[PDB]
Amino acid sequence: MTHPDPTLFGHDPWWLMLAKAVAIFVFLLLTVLSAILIERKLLGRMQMRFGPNRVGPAGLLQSLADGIKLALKEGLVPAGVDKPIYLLAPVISVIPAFVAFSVIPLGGAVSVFGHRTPLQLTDLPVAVLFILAATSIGVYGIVLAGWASGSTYPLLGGLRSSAQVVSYEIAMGLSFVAVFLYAGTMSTSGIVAAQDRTWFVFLLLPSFLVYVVSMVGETNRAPFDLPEAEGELVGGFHTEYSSLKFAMFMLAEYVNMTTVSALATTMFLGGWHAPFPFNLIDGANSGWWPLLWFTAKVWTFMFLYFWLRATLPRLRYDQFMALGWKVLIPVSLLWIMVVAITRSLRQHGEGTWAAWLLTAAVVVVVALIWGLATSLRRRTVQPPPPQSTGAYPVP
Amino acid sequence: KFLDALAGFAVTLGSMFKKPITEGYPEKPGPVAPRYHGRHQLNRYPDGLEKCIGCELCAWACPADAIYVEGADNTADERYSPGERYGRVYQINYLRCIGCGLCIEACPTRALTMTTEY
Amino acid sequence: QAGERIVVNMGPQHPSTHGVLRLILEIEGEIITEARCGIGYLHTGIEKNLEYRNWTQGVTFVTRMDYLSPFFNETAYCLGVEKLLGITDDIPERASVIRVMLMELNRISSHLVALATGGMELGAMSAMFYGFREREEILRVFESITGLRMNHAYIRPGGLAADLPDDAITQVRRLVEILPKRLKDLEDLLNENYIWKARTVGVGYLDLTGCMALGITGPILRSTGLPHDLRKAQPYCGYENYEFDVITDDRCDSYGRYIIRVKEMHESVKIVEQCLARLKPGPVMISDKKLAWPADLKLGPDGLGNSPEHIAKIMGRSMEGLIHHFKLVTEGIRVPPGQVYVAVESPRGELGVHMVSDGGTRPYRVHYRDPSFTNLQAVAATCEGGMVADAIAAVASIDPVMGGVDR
Amino acid sequence: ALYTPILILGAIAAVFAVVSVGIALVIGPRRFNRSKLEAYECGIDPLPPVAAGLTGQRIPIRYYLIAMLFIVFDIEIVFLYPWAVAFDSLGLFAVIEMLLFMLTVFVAYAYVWRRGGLNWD
Amino acid sequence: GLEERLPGGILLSTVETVAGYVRKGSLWPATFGLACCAIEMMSTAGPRFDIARFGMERFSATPRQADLMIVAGRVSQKMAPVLRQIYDQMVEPKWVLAMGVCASSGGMFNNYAVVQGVDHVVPVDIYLPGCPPRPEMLLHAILKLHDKIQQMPLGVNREEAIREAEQAALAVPPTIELKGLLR
Amino acid sequence: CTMISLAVLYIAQDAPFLGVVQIVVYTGAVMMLFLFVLMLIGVDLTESLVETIKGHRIAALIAGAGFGILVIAGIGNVSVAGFSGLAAANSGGNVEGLAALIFTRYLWAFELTSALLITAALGAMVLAHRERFERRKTQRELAIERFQTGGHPTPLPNPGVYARHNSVDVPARLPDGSESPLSVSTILPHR
Amino acid sequence: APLRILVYSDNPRTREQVRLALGKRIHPELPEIEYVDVATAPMAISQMDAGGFDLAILDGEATPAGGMGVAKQVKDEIDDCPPILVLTGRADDAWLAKWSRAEAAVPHPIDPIRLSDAVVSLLR
């Protein structure tokens, strides 16, 4: 009822919660070590390459090889950097990334060695916003790495990280609201339980889209990989970083990818419930299979990430922020209002009045957004005048 | 339909189901063109005599000064090519050779050819 | 005042600057206030090094200048040599057709490289790989025809270094068949892509007056709507007999230039189709043996070499043949003294060549007015006042190949 | 209680990250070089130690207005979470209350937008 | 680094082997094309080949992350300072691949403007002929560099190898003195 | 750091939602304050913190310390007088309880927060937003007007490149050997 | 004490030529000269790192790593680095010798008296 379920959470023996934390840590490490190689190979395929396929069998060790190489590489500390913050920034990026994933439901209750415990490190009454807070703290690593490096390109990268926050933070916060509204809680276990009837992706599609866009932004992934923007700022904020400090920045980014995709699964795709083809199968939602389904959904989001990288340029961060404040925020806010009214009407028996509203509202939005797209702006044309430099005649 | 702007996705997805096109070098090296300007090679007549007569025409034509040739006399006690001259020393500085092929066009005996080995 | 503006180097070593181009930007936070341009980080001494080599040998140098447009540089050089010799009217038809075919396939290749590098500069990573798949399709034909992938020395004064291999025509027909489809695959990534258009529409704007003032040519000029192409005005190498449309745009910005390049690829495919249509067997070298390149390359079991027939001719039978081979290979033709400025429509604009001969076997002067060098005068115009990310898009749109810039 | 697992995961992460930085600094070659330690400027010599008279001391941002608006909007949007979670328990009264509040926020937003506040970045 | 202060026994040997394996398998290039050879380097990264296969997809834009420098072009005089700055700004260990005749020895452009080999300004690990070297040749040279990296000593072994190489190098007669059949 | 710590304390005091919102909102707020520090104060400016008002530093230290001591004295021992745990309140949902209070008893204050938001927006727009008159010219605009930025020194001359000196601050050399003022940007202090 | 001069070149004949231009005692008003010869950049760098050298002569034409690159490196990497003299294989290389920051540059072929005078100027 009142999630977190008090009969499941907060009763682990010290060793068992230690082991669950360790397992989550190792799972995130292996997930990142996978995502690296899988992303490179999938990008290769999307570009008709093979990607890494030599280092170790089938190229398995390539991510591990890169990690160990960065470990074995000289630890640079450039002069002209704020040494303390220059060394802290990777830590500030890493710690919150790992912390956020604590309240992610990787499964339902299971009886490990007699102890009935969740396949989830823990859960909080405000878990979703706790993840949001951890991710927000994580951006300080990016910004302070940019600033403390004392070089123009890292400085610009860090400023782009600040702008990135200004773009995605409010959109993400608003996107959470509709899920809270249909769930009646902020715990992730409660949000998954509330999705037994149906996944909120079908119900809260606008919220899902806004959250996913703000997500791709939050992790600094293409087409919003602006803080790095190798094509503009060379290496962005992680210029001036080498070896395990750069490796920590990138591991933090990939763990943020994993955390936000796991949240997306948790609060829009039934969390760990088996998809439809296995929904009818006995015990598909029990034992360890929920872990498989959760990882499958998370990795579909990972695929979406890689696919975005392989098929889109990167916006200018001003364009992205204009997206966030002119499309994402208005759409999320109006969706929150529409969904609230819809639920109030359904609870008041109005019935059709809600359906007429809901369908109409999006229909209106889909128009006015196109208005800001083609039908009213961003699709105009002009001319110009010549100067005194004896210009030719344009046919 | 706004779908055209998304055509790129259709591309990338499609390509991740068509087979990769990479040549499998070095386990399965690709087919270089028959005409490729590979490593110069000094050839022989069927009886084994060296074709090169040491005329230095190949080195003459090299824009990069990447060929060094010293000619020397063929004699009964020691004959390397038919005729009075042969290339006793024949060096190619491959850190100056630009693979242009002018040497080949210069050579009057076909002693110098370009293989496809690279 | 000062205190709010930083001065930064886009520098030589920067992913968007092709490694040897230095944009010194005075930026107010992140708006480009001034864009100084630093050049010569790729200067190679080609214009002087040429002077110590013969004609038909300087070709190997000139193809290295603008390494993305090798056939254009070589055609400009050899057309200059022929104009000096007065042999422009005697070149075989087949050599001219092959020249048009190779220049247009090179235009496709150069624009593919331009689009790839621009797209990866603007984050469109897959643009690089798709453009380079298409480019490799053409580079295989180049390798077959010339034996080299870049810096070909295939186009030579008075003709070509050799005739097409028997399979070449079928390779080019396959190109004409597939390039439309693969180019369409590339276009799906960029043409209508909302992020790509947003990234280049209205960006790097340059007025037709600006283009005239700086001497801009090529896609940058034609994005102003002016249908100025040296292939139609001032025809050369027989373009007069090819039906093709001068591609132009009205946007005057980066996206207009991009679309012009994408459409110029199609126009090149059309011209290549025409070339194959009007490619009749014949000599590829002027019949005047006093100037014709004497070598006849032919393959064998022992690799590419002089054809054994030629060896027999010059070493067993033909004394005058031997003398001509020896002298044209070693000393090379000597061109009558004089000057001539000959221009071609390189993919990046009016690639001009000032050629001066002192009656000798070595060129007295070969100056390349490379279009990229003049186009880089537009960095100030197309970058100042805009965003640095937009300046990257503008510079990419110029498509500067620094080899030609620095020569 | 109920938070000590989060603390264990945070401790694991912090030890991992601090030891990671320590390894970065400790493992692998180390050789002092003034050029290596100088700022990266795409290969060009970085400015004199006194960067310049004035110079990059202060970085203008073109979105200061949107940053200011972000402060207030981000804080003001947190009222929705308790409202969202308590929905179906507060009744139509709270629905109308938050609809009015969100209309007030919308008026603020529309004033900012239509008057070009969101435009300069 | 401490990894090199291990005792010269089996620990140091195995650490050397694993480190060489890893450094050869993750040999990220610097995004530092110069000329023609830069285009061929991009072609090597292109799908017809796949430099990514060898763990080298990441052309590192920042010198800090780059472990390898494919010079891949002609080093003019005005570029030698910049090229050296980029080299010195990579963090060790770092290797340099002189791609092309221009980078390796100046190539055809034996002139004032060209440095005549980056060896003048930076240590060269491997020289690669070609003008430009075709992508298969670039991959060959990179594999030769992989072989060089794997057989790399560390610590006391590194010092012993430096001493042995120095002693051997002092004896080789210079190229100009290797008069063979040259009269 | 202080905001994060206070958020942790709020969580520890049986106030989860308040602490989490603290972390979130103050992450945002301190990010913006950092941006404004970079804008208005400086990127790494090391302020003197030297007393400019005669003896003001000592007076401020004394007044602050005295006020702190007095407030501590006034607080004194309070918890010993009865500390009713919050369990009876958080039961049923900490956020649920906050929603009950905010939208039932404190509804009027919640409504007035909208007035606060609107006033902040109006202040930002009135004092910060700059209307058309001060709008910076567009790149499109700049290229125009007698072909600005290119007719004029087409692209201003690059800073000089010397052996041992290639930085942007280096002025270029004119044929006579003098230093070209145009090569070095206006803002740089010569060299 | 004897002065130690690091002569760097992979060409043995250039090293012998440098050792000939500079006798055991150049400018008899000066101390004796001790020669440590190195033919590899890593060894030259390590010897410099050992220190105690009064001058280093780096053949600008050294094959695997030029003496100009080593000169710039040693000036960037050794605190209190000894003055560097460079042998340049080309007159146009002078500019790079200026960039190498070597106190002097002596063009190839090594002119004995010119090299001796340059060294005496650096070691005085």
Ligand SMILES: CC(C)=CCC/C(C)=C/CC/C(C)=C/CC/C(C)=C/CC/C(C)=C\CC/C(C)=C/CC/C(C)=C/CC/C(C)=C\CC/C(C)=C/CC1=C(C)C(=O)c2ccccc2C1=O
């Ligand atoms: C008996 C038994 C079963 C025992 C099991 C014991 C066992 C194996 C333990 C598991 C738990 C572990 C690992 C504990 C040990 C302690 C520990 C965690 C140490 C960490 C040390 C450390 C900080 C670093 C050393 C390496 C390491 C293993 C670190 C963690 C794993 C990883 C993957 C970290 C960093 C690597 C990483 C994520 C990024 C590297 C940087 C990049 C750019 C990656 C590659 C890459 C990317 C990502 C691109 O974006 C890209 C795009 C386009 C083209 C190419 C690329 C490209 O190359």
Ligand code: SF4
């Ligand atoms: S290879 Fe040919 S051109 Fe060269 S010396 Fe021998 S015979 Fe003469």
Ligand code: SF4
């Ligand atoms: S390929 Fe060209 S550069 Fe190389 S040896 Fe032959 S003629 Fe000389």
Ligand code: SF4
């Ligand atoms: S070596 Fe040849 S292909 Fe490579 S950059 Fe130099 S000229 Fe171009």
